[PDB]
Chain length 154, copies 3
């Protein structure tokens, strides 16, 4: 059961929260201070921007630290306009009880560099309420992340 | 809370509506009259088809004009079979209150051209009810689009 | 309306079920015995693994046979860590009433091979309840699939 815009203000910790980011049933997460492009970490705050080269993917830290209640799933989709620019998001579930800045994979499938300003809206997260609190809210190894978090699989 | 097939007929404006497109909990949007492949706009109605070249993406206008109620989110996924053909969709949220034909990004990640007939089913949109109407239903710059709509970000 | 972890045990047929796969609001489907990489079928059980070459996609059979009730939609997302590794999932809806092992497209958008063990968690499926049973629960040509199922579109 999806949180409308007005329930998102009341019911999702979004820091820092941006009014222009609030969408009818979701929130435009913004480009944060960290990215990972071509094997290199980017200070997107310093550089002012992340540039996703043609046919490369970036890992982009959300500016927003997102804290989910134990009964809410974060469902993320690329901003339409980045899709229209050839960018594919590869997003995971934002598990109930998640707390942290999100590390987001965007793949520039186009032949043109795709540039995002620091603090630019790029992923709309929507919020699905669970039928009741998750028995085991998120306690995975990315919890509390405030930095670009790479794969811990290996 | 997801609309089953029977609630989709009653509760989503789908024009033109196709019975073969109605799925158990979603609707197979079909390939419309416009596409954008390799920097060029395609009259998919005229050509009869869009061909997504190996390792390229296309912007495909939906044949269907979709109008969402203010309490329903459009949640889009590639048809399974296009996924099985190497095609990746990059879809945005279809925001509550959306009205228009959808511009959809499909990336042919395969090495074989992926061809879609005009009017062929290619994206199943599912419909999530919001907990209550969005306070600010969709009023973004793509509203009412009846044509391939490119990125307005810049 | 999303099934929390505890409702997934009670309300989704998952065979074989793995406790480490159960997530706060979803289940980590695991890499099954079949894959399709570079035009070739892989016995992932025999090989012990599937290797997705740089910039290629694989079709991966889920280890789990998943049976959905007629009022539940399967909503699939890549494991976060595979996203962080440059992998893009292209998933369809898991339609209500689905019964079978899922054929999943993962695209390695990275320049490094992405390897998955047989039985390794790779896609978290979440379960959205429909507002009521689908009138026509899934009866498509992939129903009952227990093998990698390719595109039947043509």
């Amino acid at each position: 059961m999806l949180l409308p815009d007005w329930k998102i203000r009341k019911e999702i910790l979004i820091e820092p929260f941006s009014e222009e980011s609030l969408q009818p049933a979701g929130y435009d997460l913004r480009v944060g201070r960290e990215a990972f492009v071509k094997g290199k970490l980017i200070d997107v705050e310093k550089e002012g921007k992340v540039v996703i080269p043609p046919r490369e993917y970036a890992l982009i830290l959300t500016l927003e630290r997102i804290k989910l209640p134990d009964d809410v799933m974060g469902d993320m989709k690329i901003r339409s306009s980045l899709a229209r620019e050839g960018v594919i998001g590869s997003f995971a579930w934002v598990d109930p009880g998640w707390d942290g800045n999100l590390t987001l994979m965007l793949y520039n499938a186009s032949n043109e560099p795709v540039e995002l300003r620091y603090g630019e809206r790029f992923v709309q997260i929507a919020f699905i309420r669970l039928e009741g609190p998750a028995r085991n809210p998120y306690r995975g190894n990315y919890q509390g992340s405030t930095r670009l978090a790479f794969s811990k699989r290996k």
